[PDB]
């Protein structure tokens, strides 16, 4: 069972565009961000036009319109900035929009210097809390750059990302684990997914684990079972149609869950109910599932209207619903409803450990 709620779409700004990454309100509740892509059929329009919506207000208009010059390859909210919107681009500059200024252009654009990114940033993110935060931009070039949300003309802390060999690490949708232990996992271009540190001389790339050959599209981490498990588990996504569960100590671990007749594009599993991961396809199917109940099948899955290549999906934080980003500019909103967080749900840990023994 999947509770298909309302949808968000506006032809005024989703006119034959590609829905890029998403994010829910990391500060507010259920008011999400939608990064888009350029539509070369409309060259007069801005390339990257981000948009937001408000599920808690129950309306249809894209509440805010924001648009830099280039195509926004990534976007999300800002940590403890209830007026700001951070953003990655295709060119390499990192933008910064504001809502209260009513300026449909970002007010603080990262330069295009070598010290900054001159390659698209697929994953730019805030990290800790009030005093524990920063802004880490990681372009596909292979550089990380810490930035304050105040100073943006120069990266606060910045270094590259290379393996033991001096070859580049074409990152794609990295993710910090729970707690910001600075050991963020990095979805590389294809295979060689890495764990990478930030503080110490050992910062950067820790080790390579390869369990799939198709080019990576996403990664995610999660939290506690209700203070039962460590939950450092992180699942990935790739173009080989398979999704592998990983560990911080394995190299070719846990069963690579494969969805056939579909090009996997993203995974993100809500820490609420320790295992409820949702993958997507290049056909219009949301085949999400829990590993405790099922084993290798989508639990309460659904397909999507028409055949949209579902680009990105995000669980509604601290609760349950699903944001859906397609290859076509349209946002769909589903919900589990009946797939409530099971209490004392350690069945999954016993399950994954029993599978891990073979």
């Amino acid at each position: 069972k999947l509770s298909l709620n309302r949808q968000f779409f506006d032809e005024r700004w989703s006119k034959h565009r590609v829905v890029s990454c998403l994010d829910w309100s990391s500060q507010y509740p259920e008011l999400l961000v939608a990064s888009y892509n350029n539509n070369e059929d409309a060259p007069h329009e801005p390339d990257g036009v981000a948009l937001v919506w408000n599920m808690k207000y129950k309306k249809t208009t894209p509440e805010y319109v924001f648009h830099c010059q280039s195509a926004v390859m990534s976007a999300t909210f800002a940590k403890f900035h209830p007026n700001l919107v951070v953003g990655g681009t295709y060119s390499g500059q990192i933008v910064l929009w504001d809502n209260r200024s009513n300026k449909r252009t970002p007010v603080q654009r990262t330069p295009l210097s070598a010290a900054a990114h001159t390659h698209p940033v697929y994953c730019v993110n805030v990290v800790g809390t009030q005093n524990a935060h920063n802004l880490i931009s990681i372009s596909t070039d292979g550089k990380i750059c810490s930035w304050s949300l105040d100073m943006l003309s120069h990266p606060q802390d910045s270094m590259e990302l290379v393996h033991k060999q001096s070859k580049a690490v074409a990152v794609t949708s990295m993710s910090f684990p729970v707690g910001d232990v600075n050991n963020f996992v990095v979805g590389s271009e294809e295979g060689s997914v890495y764990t990478a540190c930030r503080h110490g001389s050992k910062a950067g790339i820790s080790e390579m684990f390869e369990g799939h050959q198709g080019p990576i599209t996403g990664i995610h981490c999660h939290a506690a079972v209700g203070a039962v498990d460590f939950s450092h588990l992180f699942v990935t996504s790739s173009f080989d149609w398979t999704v592998k569960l990983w560990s911080t100590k394995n190299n070719k671990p846990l069963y690579s869950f494969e969805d056939n007749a579909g090009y996997v594009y993203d995974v993100m599993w809500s820490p609420t109910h320790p295992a409820l991961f949702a993958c997507v396809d290049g056909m219009g199917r949301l085949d999400l599932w829990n590993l405790n109940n099922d084993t290798e099948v989508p639990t309460a899955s659904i397909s999507v209207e028409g055949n949209p290549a579902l680009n990105r999906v995000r669980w509604t934080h601290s609760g349950r619903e699903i944001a859906v980003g397609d290859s076509e500019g349209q946002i769909v909103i589903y919900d589990v409803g009946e797939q409530i967080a099971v209490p004392r749900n350690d069945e999954w840990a016993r399950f994954g450990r029993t599978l891990a023994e073979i």
Partner: protein, 36 residues
């Protein structure tokens, strides 16, 4: 020290609006000219 420097933005903005208003008063009073 960034450790220290993180938790003061609220107070900073309070002081900025103070600075703001006073420089605005300077725009006002200097916009009136010396002969008058």
């Amino acid at each position: 020290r960034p450790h220290i420097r993180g938790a003061i933005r609220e107070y900073q903005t309070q002081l900025i609006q103070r600075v703001k208003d006073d420089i605005e008063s300077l725009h006002d009073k200097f916009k009136v000219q010396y002969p008058q």
